[PDB]
Design a protein around this ligand. Sequence first.
Ligand SMILES: [Ca+2]
Ligand SMILES: [Ca+2]
Length: 274
Amino acid sequence: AQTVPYGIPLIKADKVQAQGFKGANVKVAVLDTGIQASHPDLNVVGGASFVAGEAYNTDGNGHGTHVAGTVAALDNTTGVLGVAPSVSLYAVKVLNSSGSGSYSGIVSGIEWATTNGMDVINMSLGGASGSTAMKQAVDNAYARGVVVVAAAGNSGNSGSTNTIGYPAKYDSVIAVGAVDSNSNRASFSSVGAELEVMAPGAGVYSTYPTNTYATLNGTXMASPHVAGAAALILSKHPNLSASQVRNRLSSTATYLGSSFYYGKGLINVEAAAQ
Ligand SMILES: [Ca+2]
Ligand SMILES: [Ca+2]
């Protein structure tokens, strides 16, 4: 029997999936530690590794397989259900088993995904600094029509300190914060002027290496929900631009409070797909 995580109904993705739009023919690339491709509730159609020694179809850490399950775990009678269970899923391995990569590795992942025509890029990762080539790669991606989503960061609120990290801090990247099952800001969610929307990030249940399932906490769990919401909108309205997908998501968000803490608010993909 399949479990539906609380996140899928809280962002109303089940409402859109019942209308018949499940993400078919949208290509989503997960830039992360890889994906365990043999996992029975995941279908990975391809990908690339910029980690020497490792292929994309292995996840030595866990983080990548979890983030992918939240975007695309298959709608069946097994494990969990993703936000866009019919997308074409691509694994781009830019982080190692330890969950560390260099800026160049990440940049070659972004570049590979823009060049292989992904509709949506998810980066559940954040550095303390940017990089000129990283700014150019996401600006490039977004100018080519790719929706670019990343985790705002898990640095919490500190007075009026802007704690949003990179690539989220760039203007061509949707910075995603974290709420819990009661729609409260998760204490670790970064704050700052660039925070755009919030999604489920506390206690998220999803696929995990080796044919199992796990609960993790992070804006890194919040981000795949928005990458999945974009995929649903695009399988329903397939000639929209990336700024049109981006604009449906923040203009229809449910207001939760001050933008420093919440951005435009909690996404509602039913309202955004209308
Ligand atoms: Ca399933
Ligand atoms: Ca941004």
